[PDB]
Amino acid sequence: MAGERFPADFVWGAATAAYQIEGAVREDGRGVSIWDTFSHTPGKIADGTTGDVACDSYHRYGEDIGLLNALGMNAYRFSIAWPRIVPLGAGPINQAGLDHYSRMVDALLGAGLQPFVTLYHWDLPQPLEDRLGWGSRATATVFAEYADIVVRQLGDRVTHWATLNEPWCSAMLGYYLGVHAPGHTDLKRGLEASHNLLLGHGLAVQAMRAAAPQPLQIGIVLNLTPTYPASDSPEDVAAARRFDGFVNRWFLDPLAGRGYPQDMLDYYGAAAPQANPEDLTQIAAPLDWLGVNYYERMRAVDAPDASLPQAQRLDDPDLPHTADREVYPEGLYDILLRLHNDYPFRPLYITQNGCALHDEIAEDGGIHDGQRQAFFEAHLAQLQRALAAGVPLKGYFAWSLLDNFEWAMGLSMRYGICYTNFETLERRIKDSGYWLRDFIAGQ
Ligand SMILES: OC[C@H]1O[C@@H](O)[C@H](O)[C@@H](O)[C@@H]1O
């Protein structure tokens, strides 16, 4: 319809992550990941669940393909589990793991679904964490070797690759705030991890281009949180700037060849890595695209007594909330306009966008998730505004294809466009999924 059309070659998909969906944690040579360790640690997961079974997608990926087909998607964004490919992190290959993903790629291509592969969505092999994990430069080197191994096997068929998904999460939630695996709580550890993740990224790009049998389109995927000061006071504006630095610019700027943002370097002081020029060069290895994951904004107030970056969220109770977040579609417009005007990355993909609700199977057997339908409608409206402004946006992936193991929240927190019955492993398309289907089909 008028003003609602996307390009005919637009990528339309849904996204998942391996540990969240696959299960089969010890099958076919898979090693132990930090998320195996962490979810089996008492108290770390809200509801006592683990990824041991999850959606059982290792075995049931064909059912997932069925859902993607029923939704009329043309792509699927998924991650490869490093523990299935190099079970010790640095060590022998596990060919059974590569063969699994090779079959899955062929199944997707046979269904007309373009695979968008993420190499790292948080499942670091535990042996590497025993040697400091992302706290060690050596983890970056062996990440790049893993990236080489996978591209050698799959790069004849998969053109679109991301290295990392959300390094801010891996570094800050995993090593500073302790809420994600491996669960450390130190700023310096988080910042060191952030550097070695970026370095791993850059080394992997270069290794991937060398190993690939055809030219690849290589990206990185960042979560970006547009930040707004709660008032125009100097204290609140500065807090917004610091939070923006903490999440967004700390990664955008070095990727853009701009070094680390100097305001944040000066703020972090000696807790930040010494970033020698050689490493910054590697970090800025040229990228073919950037993936944006968008959920929420941050409306920031100063919080002098809080941990760095001394900025807390002030919830606007005017705006409505999902099960776990404030809904703010216009922030997607703002962040895309910022990337378009202020940074060099292009084209752009929205690699995750979605929401969590208290979804229930209704008496009729459907899932009436109208707030999620409205979430998608409003965000896609902002993407059409962004396209109208000249933003080079080439695709959209709904987060998530199906309800899954939602990290520290366990099975409790449902982000799917399809409902997963975790006892029977049945999947059912929610109403929001049928809305997406029909919206995409109108294209
Ligand atoms: O809650 C937002 C988060 O959802 C998770 O399901 C995804 O794996 C993350 O990549 C994302 O940061």
PDB file of all heavy atoms in Angstrom, residues 391-418:
ATOM      1  N   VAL A 391      18.120   6.428   4.037  1.00  0.00           N
ATOM      2  CA  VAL A 391      18.937   5.444   4.771  1.00  0.00           C
ATOM      3  C   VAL A 391      19.003   4.173   3.936  1.00  0.00           C
ATOM      4  O   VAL A 391      17.954   3.644   3.528  1.00  0.00           O
ATOM      5  CB  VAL A 391      18.378   5.135   6.142  1.00  0.00           C
ATOM      6  CG1 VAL A 391      19.210   4.055   6.825  1.00  0.00           C
ATOM      7  CG2 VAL A 391      18.328   6.398   7.001  1.00  0.00           C
ATOM      8  N   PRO A 392      20.213   3.628   3.725  1.00  0.00           N
ATOM      9  CA  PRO A 392      20.392   2.455   2.867  1.00  0.00           C
ATOM     10  C   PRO A 392      20.119   1.132   3.576  1.00  0.00           C
ATOM     11  O   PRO A 392      21.077   0.377   3.815  1.00  0.00           O
ATOM     12  CB  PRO A 392      21.855   2.517   2.436  1.00  0.00           C
ATOM     13  CG  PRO A 392      22.550   3.203   3.597  1.00  0.00           C
ATOM     14  CD  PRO A 392      21.523   4.165   4.146  1.00  0.00           C
ATOM     15  N   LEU A 393      18.860   0.913   3.893  1.00  0.00           N
ATOM     16  CA  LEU A 393      18.451  -0.243   4.664  1.00  0.00           C
ATOM     17  C   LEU A 393      18.012  -1.370   3.729  1.00  0.00           C
ATOM     18  O   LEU A 393      17.029  -1.189   3.001  1.00  0.00           O
ATOM     19  CB  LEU A 393      17.291   0.193   5.544  1.00  0.00           C
ATOM     20  CG  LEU A 393      16.711  -0.912   6.403  1.00  0.00           C
ATOM     21  CD1 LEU A 393      17.695  -1.255   7.516  1.00  0.00           C
ATOM     22  CD2 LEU A 393      15.351  -0.515   6.914  1.00  0.00           C
ATOM     23  N   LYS A 394      18.672  -2.556   3.848  1.00  0.00           N
ATOM     24  CA  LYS A 394      18.492  -3.664   2.913  1.00  0.00           C
ATOM     25  C   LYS A 394      17.758  -4.855   3.523  1.00  0.00           C
ATOM     26  O   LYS A 394      17.451  -5.793   2.783  1.00  0.00           O
ATOM     27  CB  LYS A 394      19.830  -4.080   2.324  1.00  0.00           C
ATOM     28  CG  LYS A 394      20.351  -3.056   1.316  1.00  0.00           C
ATOM     29  CD  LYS A 394      21.455  -3.573   0.486  1.00  0.00           C
ATOM     30  CE  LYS A 394      21.020  -4.411  -0.691  1.00  0.00           C
ATOM     31  NZ  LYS A 394      22.201  -4.783  -1.508  1.00  0.00           N
ATOM     32  N   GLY A 395      17.415  -4.820   4.793  1.00  0.00           N
ATOM     33  CA  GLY A 395      16.635  -5.933   5.297  1.00  0.00           C
ATOM     34  C   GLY A 395      16.197  -5.775   6.735  1.00  0.00           C
ATOM     35  O   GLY A 395      16.672  -4.879   7.458  1.00  0.00           O
ATOM     36  N   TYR A 396      15.347  -6.689   7.167  1.00  0.00           N
ATOM     37  CA  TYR A 396      14.700  -6.661   8.460  1.00  0.00           C
ATOM     38  C   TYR A 396      14.544  -8.087   8.945  1.00  0.00           C
ATOM     39  O   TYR A 396      13.913  -8.893   8.255  1.00  0.00           O
ATOM     40  CB  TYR A 396      13.334  -5.977   8.429  1.00  0.00           C
ATOM     41  CG  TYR A 396      12.664  -5.900   9.761  1.00  0.00           C
ATOM     42  CD1 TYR A 396      12.963  -4.881  10.652  1.00  0.00           C
ATOM     43  CD2 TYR A 396      11.754  -6.862  10.150  1.00  0.00           C
ATOM     44  CE1 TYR A 396      12.288  -4.806  11.855  1.00  0.00           C
ATOM     45  CE2 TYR A 396      11.087  -6.798  11.358  1.00  0.00           C
ATOM     46  CZ  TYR A 396      11.363  -5.756  12.229  1.00  0.00           C
ATOM     47  OH  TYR A 396      10.680  -5.776  13.402  1.00  0.00           O
ATOM     48  N   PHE A 397      15.024  -8.361  10.156  1.00  0.00           N
ATOM     49  CA  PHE A 397      14.793  -9.650  10.788  1.00  0.00           C
ATOM     50  C   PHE A 397      14.071  -9.478  12.111  1.00  0.00           C
ATOM     51  O   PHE A 397      14.562  -8.805  13.049  1.00  0.00           O
ATOM     52  CB  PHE A 397      16.126 -10.339  11.108  1.00  0.00           C
ATOM     53  CG  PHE A 397      16.931 -10.752   9.913  1.00  0.00           C
ATOM     54  CD1 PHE A 397      17.690  -9.843   9.217  1.00  0.00           C
ATOM     55  CD2 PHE A 397      16.802 -12.012   9.382  1.00  0.00           C
ATOM     56  CE1 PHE A 397      18.417 -10.209   8.095  1.00  0.00           C
ATOM     57  CE2 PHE A 397      17.526 -12.379   8.265  1.00  0.00           C
ATOM     58  CZ  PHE A 397      18.325 -11.488   7.594  1.00  0.00           C
ATOM     59  N   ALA A 398      12.913 -10.081  12.239  1.00  0.00           N
ATOM     60  CA  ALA A 398      12.137 -10.126  13.456  1.00  0.00           C
ATOM     61  C   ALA A 398      12.856 -10.974  14.490  1.00  0.00           C
ATOM     62  O   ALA A 398      13.295 -12.091  14.189  1.00  0.00           O
ATOM     63  CB  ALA A 398      10.781 -10.706  13.221  1.00  0.00           C
ATOM     64  N   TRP A 399      12.994 -10.404  15.667  1.00  0.00           N
ATOM     65  CA  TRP A 399      13.456 -11.131  16.832  1.00  0.00           C
ATOM     66  C   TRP A 399      12.265 -11.611  17.620  1.00  0.00           C
ATOM     67  O   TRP A 399      11.451 -10.750  17.979  1.00  0.00           O
ATOM     68  CB  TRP A 399      14.332 -10.249  17.731  1.00  0.00           C
ATOM     69  CG  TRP A 399      14.929 -11.101  18.803  1.00  0.00           C
ATOM     70  CD1 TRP A 399      14.522 -11.239  20.093  1.00  0.00           C
ATOM     71  CD2 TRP A 399      15.956 -12.087  18.613  1.00  0.00           C
ATOM     72  NE1 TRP A 399      15.233 -12.233  20.714  1.00  0.00           N
ATOM     73  CE2 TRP A 399      16.147 -12.747  19.840  1.00  0.00           C
ATOM     74  CE3 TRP A 399      16.750 -12.427  17.521  1.00  0.00           C
ATOM     75  CZ2 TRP A 399      17.083 -13.744  20.016  1.00  0.00           C
ATOM     76  CZ3 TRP A 399      17.720 -13.383  17.714  1.00  0.00           C
ATOM     77  CH2 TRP A 399      17.854 -14.033  18.926  1.00  0.00           C
ATOM     78  N   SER A 400      12.077 -12.883  17.925  1.00  0.00           N
ATOM     79  CA  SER A 400      12.825 -14.062  17.482  1.00  0.00           C
ATOM     80  C   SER A 400      11.877 -14.930  16.687  1.00  0.00           C
ATOM     81  O   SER A 400      10.674 -14.790  16.777  1.00  0.00           O
ATOM     82  CB  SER A 400      13.356 -14.821  18.684  1.00  0.00           C
ATOM     83  OG  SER A 400      14.065 -15.993  18.265  1.00  0.00           O
ATOM     84  N   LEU A 401      12.383 -15.855  15.870  1.00  0.00           N
ATOM     85  CA  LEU A 401      11.482 -16.771  15.194  1.00  0.00           C
ATOM     86  C   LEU A 401      10.582 -17.482  16.194  1.00  0.00           C
ATOM     87  O   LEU A 401       9.401 -17.671  15.893  1.00  0.00           O
ATOM     88  CB  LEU A 401      12.322 -17.787  14.398  1.00  0.00           C
ATOM     89  CG  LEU A 401      11.526 -18.897  13.698  1.00  0.00           C
ATOM     90  CD1 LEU A 401      10.609 -18.303  12.653  1.00  0.00           C
ATOM     91  CD2 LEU A 401      12.473 -19.933  13.089  1.00  0.00           C
ATOM     92  N   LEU A 402      11.141 -17.956  17.305  1.00  0.00           N
ATOM     93  CA  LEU A 402      10.288 -18.677  18.237  1.00  0.00           C
ATOM     94  C   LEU A 402      10.755 -18.403  19.643  1.00  0.00           C
ATOM     95  O   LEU A 402      11.807 -17.861  19.871  1.00  0.00           O
ATOM     96  CB  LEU A 402      10.198 -20.169  17.923  1.00  0.00           C
ATOM     97  CG  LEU A 402      11.500 -20.970  18.151  1.00  0.00           C
ATOM     98  CD1 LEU A 402      11.279 -22.475  17.954  1.00  0.00           C
ATOM     99  CD2 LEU A 402      12.662 -20.578  17.271  1.00  0.00           C
ATOM    100  N   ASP A 403       9.845 -18.651  20.591  1.00  0.00           N
ATOM    101  CA  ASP A 403      10.171 -18.445  21.992  1.00  0.00           C
ATOM    102  C   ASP A 403      11.354 -19.354  22.331  1.00  0.00           C
ATOM    103  O   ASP A 403      11.426 -20.481  21.882  1.00  0.00           O
ATOM    104  CB  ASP A 403       8.994 -18.787  22.895  1.00  0.00           C
ATOM    105  CG  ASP A 403       7.772 -17.926  22.669  1.00  0.00           C
ATOM    106  OD1 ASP A 403       7.936 -16.767  22.338  1.00  0.00           O
ATOM    107  OD2 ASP A 403       6.687 -18.493  22.922  1.00  0.00           O
ATOM    108  N   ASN A 404      12.249 -18.886  23.181  1.00  0.00           N
ATOM    109  CA  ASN A 404      13.455 -19.664  23.413  1.00  0.00           C
ATOM    110  C   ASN A 404      14.011 -19.462  24.814  1.00  0.00           C
ATOM    111  O   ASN A 404      13.359 -18.885  25.664  1.00  0.00           O
ATOM    112  CB  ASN A 404      14.396 -19.369  22.262  1.00  0.00           C
ATOM    113  CG  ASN A 404      14.724 -17.906  22.271  1.00  0.00           C
ATOM    114  OD1 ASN A 404      15.186 -17.383  23.252  1.00  0.00           O
ATOM    115  ND2 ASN A 404      14.483 -17.238  21.180  1.00  0.00           N
ATOM    116  N   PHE A 405      15.215 -19.992  25.023  1.00  0.00           N
ATOM    117  CA  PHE A 405      15.944 -19.785  26.278  1.00  0.00           C
ATOM    118  C   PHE A 405      16.498 -18.362  26.293  1.00  0.00           C
ATOM    119  O   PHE A 405      17.496 -18.079  25.632  1.00  0.00           O
ATOM    120  CB  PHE A 405      17.034 -20.856  26.433  1.00  0.00           C
ATOM    121  CG  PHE A 405      17.846 -20.662  27.681  1.00  0.00           C
ATOM    122  CD1 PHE A 405      17.354 -21.113  28.898  1.00  0.00           C
ATOM    123  CD2 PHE A 405      19.087 -20.024  27.674  1.00  0.00           C
ATOM    124  CE1 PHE A 405      18.076 -20.899  30.054  1.00  0.00           C
ATOM    125  CE2 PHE A 405      19.799 -19.826  28.851  1.00  0.00           C
ATOM    126  CZ  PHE A 405      19.267 -20.271  30.032  1.00  0.00           C
ATOM    127  N   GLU A 406      15.877 -17.458  27.052  1.00  0.00           N
ATOM    128  CA  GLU A 406      16.151 -16.040  27.045  1.00  0.00           C
ATOM    129  C   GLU A 406      17.195 -15.733  28.123  1.00  0.00           C
ATOM    130  O   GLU A 406      17.000 -14.931  29.043  1.00  0.00           O
ATOM    131  CB  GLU A 406      14.836 -15.270  27.255  1.00  0.00           C
ATOM    132  CG  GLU A 406      14.929 -13.750  27.274  1.00  0.00           C
ATOM    133  CD  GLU A 406      15.819 -13.046  26.255  1.00  0.00           C
ATOM    134  OE1 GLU A 406      15.838 -13.517  25.101  1.00  0.00           O
ATOM    135  OE2 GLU A 406      16.432 -11.920  26.609  1.00  0.00           O
ATOM    136  N   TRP A 407      18.347 -16.376  27.976  1.00  0.00           N
ATOM    137  CA  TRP A 407      19.520 -16.050  28.761  1.00  0.00           C
ATOM    138  C   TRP A 407      19.173 -16.069  30.248  1.00  0.00           C
ATOM    139  O   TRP A 407      18.691 -17.090  30.744  1.00  0.00           O
ATOM    140  CB  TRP A 407      20.152 -14.748  28.250  1.00  0.00           C
ATOM    141  CG  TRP A 407      20.420 -14.751  26.775  1.00  0.00           C
ATOM    142  CD1 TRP A 407      19.932 -13.871  25.833  1.00  0.00           C
ATOM    143  CD2 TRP A 407      21.329 -15.639  26.065  1.00  0.00           C
ATOM    144  NE1 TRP A 407      20.405 -14.211  24.608  1.00  0.00           N
ATOM    145  CE2 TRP A 407      21.264 -15.268  24.694  1.00  0.00           C
ATOM    146  CE3 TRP A 407      22.160 -16.730  26.405  1.00  0.00           C
ATOM    147  CZ2 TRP A 407      22.055 -15.867  23.729  1.00  0.00           C
ATOM    148  CZ3 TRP A 407      22.897 -17.353  25.418  1.00  0.00           C
ATOM    149  CH2 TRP A 407      22.842 -16.922  24.093  1.00  0.00           C
ATOM    150  N   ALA A 408      19.521 -15.024  30.983  1.00  0.00           N
ATOM    151  CA  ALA A 408      19.301 -15.017  32.425  1.00  0.00           C
ATOM    152  C   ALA A 408      17.839 -15.071  32.820  1.00  0.00           C
ATOM    153  O   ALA A 408      17.550 -15.325  34.010  1.00  0.00           O
ATOM    154  CB  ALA A 408      20.007 -13.840  33.055  1.00  0.00           C
ATOM    155  N   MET A 409      16.927 -14.839  31.892  1.00  0.00           N
ATOM    156  CA  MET A 409      15.508 -14.941  32.224  1.00  0.00           C
ATOM    157  C   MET A 409      14.979 -16.350  31.961  1.00  0.00           C
ATOM    158  O   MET A 409      13.813 -16.651  32.243  1.00  0.00           O
ATOM    159  CB  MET A 409      14.656 -13.939  31.439  1.00  0.00           C
ATOM    160  CG  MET A 409      14.735 -12.537  31.985  1.00  0.00           C
ATOM    161  SD  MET A 409      14.738 -12.377  33.782  1.00  0.00           S
ATOM    162  CE  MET A 409      13.274 -13.280  34.288  1.00  0.00           C
ATOM    163  N   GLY A 410      15.775 -17.238  31.369  1.00  0.00           N
ATOM    164  CA  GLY A 410      15.309 -18.595  31.174  1.00  0.00           C
ATOM    165  C   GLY A 410      14.210 -18.693  30.133  1.00  0.00           C
ATOM    166  O   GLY A 410      14.090 -17.854  29.249  1.00  0.00           O
ATOM    167  N   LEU A 411      13.400 -19.720  30.296  1.00  0.00           N
ATOM    168  CA  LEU A 411      12.281 -19.986  29.404  1.00  0.00           C
ATOM    169  C   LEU A 411      11.106 -19.065  29.701  1.00  0.00           C
ATOM    170  O   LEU A 411      10.139 -19.058  28.901  1.00  0.00           O
ATOM    171  CB  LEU A 411      11.921 -21.466  29.525  1.00  0.00           C
ATOM    172  CG  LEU A 411      13.023 -22.422  29.108  1.00  0.00           C
ATOM    173  CD1 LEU A 411      12.562 -23.875  29.336  1.00  0.00           C
ATOM    174  CD2 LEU A 411      13.465 -22.197  27.668  1.00  0.00           C
ATOM    175  N   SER A 412      11.222 -18.229  30.747  1.00  0.00           N
ATOM    176  CA  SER A 412      10.114 -17.472  31.291  1.00  0.00           C
ATOM    177  C   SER A 412       9.692 -16.321  30.382  1.00  0.00           C
ATOM    178  O   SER A 412       8.533 -15.932  30.421  1.00  0.00           O
ATOM    179  CB  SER A 412      10.370 -16.998  32.711  1.00  0.00           C
ATOM    180  OG  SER A 412      11.305 -15.920  32.816  1.00  0.00           O
ATOM    181  N   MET A 413      10.594 -15.809  29.531  1.00  0.00           N
ATOM    182  CA  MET A 413      10.428 -14.536  28.882  1.00  0.00           C
ATOM    183  C   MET A 413      10.367 -14.783  27.365  1.00  0.00           C
ATOM    184  O   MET A 413      11.362 -15.167  26.750  1.00  0.00           O
ATOM    185  CB  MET A 413      11.616 -13.629  29.241  1.00  0.00           C
ATOM    186  CG  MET A 413      11.492 -12.270  28.702  1.00  0.00           C
ATOM    187  SD  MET A 413      10.170 -11.322  29.508  1.00  0.00           S
ATOM    188  CE  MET A 413      10.870 -11.043  31.137  1.00  0.00           C
ATOM    189  N   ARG A 414       9.180 -14.579  26.768  1.00  0.00           N
ATOM    190  CA  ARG A 414       8.856 -15.048  25.422  1.00  0.00           C
ATOM    191  C   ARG A 414       8.951 -13.929  24.405  1.00  0.00           C
ATOM    192  O   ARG A 414       8.157 -12.987  24.402  1.00  0.00           O
ATOM    193  CB  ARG A 414       7.439 -15.612  25.402  1.00  0.00           C
ATOM    194  CG  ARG A 414       7.282 -16.918  26.150  1.00  0.00           C
ATOM    195  CD  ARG A 414       5.881 -17.471  26.140  1.00  0.00           C
ATOM    196  NE  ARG A 414       5.782 -18.702  26.894  1.00  0.00           N
ATOM    197  CZ  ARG A 414       6.085 -19.916  26.476  1.00  0.00           C
ATOM    198  NH1 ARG A 414       6.400 -20.131  25.195  1.00  0.00           N
ATOM    199  NH2 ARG A 414       6.028 -20.963  27.280  1.00  0.00           N
ATOM    200  N   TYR A 415       9.959 -14.026  23.495  1.00  0.00           N
ATOM    201  CA  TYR A 415      10.216 -13.070  22.431  1.00  0.00           C
ATOM    202  C   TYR A 415       9.774 -13.536  21.038  1.00  0.00           C
ATOM    203  O   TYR A 415      10.005 -12.813  20.081  1.00  0.00           O
ATOM    204  CB  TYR A 415      11.712 -12.742  22.379  1.00  0.00           C
ATOM    205  CG  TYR A 415      12.136 -11.584  23.254  1.00  0.00           C
ATOM    206  CD1 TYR A 415      12.632 -11.768  24.533  1.00  0.00           C
ATOM    207  CD2 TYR A 415      12.117 -10.285  22.754  1.00  0.00           C
ATOM    208  CE1 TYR A 415      13.022 -10.708  25.333  1.00  0.00           C
ATOM    209  CE2 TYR A 415      12.511  -9.214  23.538  1.00  0.00           C
ATOM    210  CZ  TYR A 415      12.920  -9.416  24.843  1.00  0.00           C
ATOM    211  OH  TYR A 415      13.290  -8.288  25.574  1.00  0.00           O
ATOM    212  N   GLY A 416       9.220 -14.726  20.922  1.00  0.00           N
ATOM    213  CA  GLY A 416       8.951 -15.303  19.598  1.00  0.00           C
ATOM    214  C   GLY A 416       7.831 -14.606  18.832  1.00  0.00           C
ATOM    215  O   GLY A 416       6.860 -14.142  19.445  1.00  0.00           O
ATOM    216  N   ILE A 417       7.873 -14.727  17.500  1.00  0.00           N
ATOM    217  CA  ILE A 417       6.691 -14.560  16.654  1.00  0.00           C
ATOM    218  C   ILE A 417       5.937 -15.876  16.529  1.00  0.00           C
ATOM    219  O   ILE A 417       4.784 -15.887  16.057  1.00  0.00           O
ATOM    220  CB  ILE A 417       7.010 -13.883  15.328  1.00  0.00           C
ATOM    221  CG1 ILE A 417       7.903 -14.777  14.456  1.00  0.00           C
ATOM    222  CG2 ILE A 417       7.633 -12.536  15.618  1.00  0.00           C
ATOM    223  CD1 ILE A 417       8.258 -14.183  13.113  1.00  0.00           C
ATOM    224  N   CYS A 418       6.564 -16.985  16.947  1.00  0.00           N
ATOM    225  CA  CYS A 418       5.939 -18.274  17.126  1.00  0.00           C
ATOM    226  C   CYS A 418       6.117 -18.687  18.601  1.00  0.00           C
ATOM    227  O   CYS A 418       7.190 -18.515  19.186  1.00  0.00           O
ATOM    228  CB  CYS A 418       6.554 -19.339  16.222  1.00  0.00           C
ATOM    229  SG  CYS A 418       6.616 -18.912  14.464  1.00  0.00           S
TER     230      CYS A 418
END
